[PDB]
Paper text:
Strikingly, however, the “catalytic loop” found in all other MacroD-type enzymes (also termed “loop 1”) is replaced with and extended loop containing the zinc-coordinating Cx(4)HxC motif, here termed the Zn-loop. In all structures, the Zn2+ ion is tetrahedrally coordinated with three metal-coordination residues within the Zn-loop, while the fourth coordination-contact is exchangeable and is provided by either ADPr, a water molecule, or a symmetry-related protomer within the crystal.
As before, SpyMacro WT from the extended operon background could remove the ADP-ribosyl modification. ADPr is tightly coordinated within the active site. Within the SpyMacro structure, the adenosine base is coordinated via an Asp92-adenine C6 amino group contact and Phe251 π-stacks with the base. The proximal ribose is rotated out of the active side and the C3′ position makes a conserved contact with Thr213. The C2′ OH moiety is solvent exposed, but the local environment makes it unlikely that a poly-ADPr chain could be accommodated, thus suggesting that Zn-Macros can only interact with terminal ADPr or mono-ADPr moieties. The ADPr diphosphate is primarily coordinated via residues of the—in MacroD-type enzymes—identified diphosphate-binding loop (also termed ‘loop 2’), which is located on the opposite side of the binding cleft relative to the catalytic loop. In SpyMacro, the ribose adopts a furanose ring with a 2′ endo pucker, while the distal ribose in MorMacro is in the linear form. Second, upon ADPr bind, the cavity is closed due to the reorientation of Phe216 (SpyMacro) into the active site to help fix the orientation of the distal ribose within the catalytic centre. We could observe an isostructural water molecule in our structures of SpyMacro and MorMacro in complex with ADPr and Asn-ADPr, respectively, thus suggesting that the Pα phosphate group could act as Lewis base in the reaction.
Author numbering: 1 to 19, 32 to 266
Amino acid sequence: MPSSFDLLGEMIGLLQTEQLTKRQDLWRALINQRPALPLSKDYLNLEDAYLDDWRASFVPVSVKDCQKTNYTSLFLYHGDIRYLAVDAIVNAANSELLGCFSPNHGCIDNAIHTFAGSRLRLACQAIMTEQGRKEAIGQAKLTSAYHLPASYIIHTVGPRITKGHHVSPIRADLLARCYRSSLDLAVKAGLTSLAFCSISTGEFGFPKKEAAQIAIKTVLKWQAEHPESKTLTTIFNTFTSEDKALYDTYLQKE
Ligand SMILES: Nc1ncnc2c1ncn2[C@@H]1O[C@H](COP(=O)(O)OP(=O)(O)OC[C@H]2O[C@H](O)[C@H](O)[C@@H]2O)[C@@H](O)[C@H]1O
Ligand SMILES: [Zn+2]
């Protein structure tokens, strides 16, 4: 029943006593760094109220609002993945699948985990314990998207590129795997819209130009090979001005 500002304050108090000036940032740091242990019901209710208020504060971007391109059913969205109302968003995860523990990190995993909320980290832990092993590169796992406007998250782990190294055919195809696996899973889940982030191009150091070429080529080859899934709209979600320019050059050349 507290206000959103007051909710942040109470959540911060619970997390601080259990064991950067904007309150949202302090809260985020604390929840980010928290090992994936069970969570008080009291905390979860505050966080749920907070994320519901967050949701009430914007109108999600719809698939219709995205930019069309030269290629049928491939669309472009330049913005934060947290505001996109699609069937599934693809998270560029790590192999433990537990999200990002680095406070207020600028990666998509952190943004997705923080605003989906804490039930996502707990769900991922249960999934990964059940599995009994870390995730391999280029696979796909489906979870709910919790408080996000998307319905589902598809978690995939892309390849790292050692700094200075170029993209070999193998490493190219490891990135391609993420796209193929995510598309295959979306179809099997009966979804009709999927948003990809620029997997591997942040923390994992995959060069943006090659990554965009791979992403586009892989989705187009998949569409040609999988006629059954022409019902699927794919959105490429760019977040950096460099990615915006690359995707524009490859999908919207006149
Ligand atoms: N809110 C956002 N919406 C859309 N795209 C975003 C957003 N935030 C970042 N991006 C873009 O998302 C893209 C991917 O950058 P990264 O998220 O580093 O993913 P990786 O696969 O390279 O690294 C994964 C590791 O880093 C994490 O800590 C994980 O836990 C793993 O340990 C870039 O284009 C970003 O600009
Ligand atoms: Zn991170």
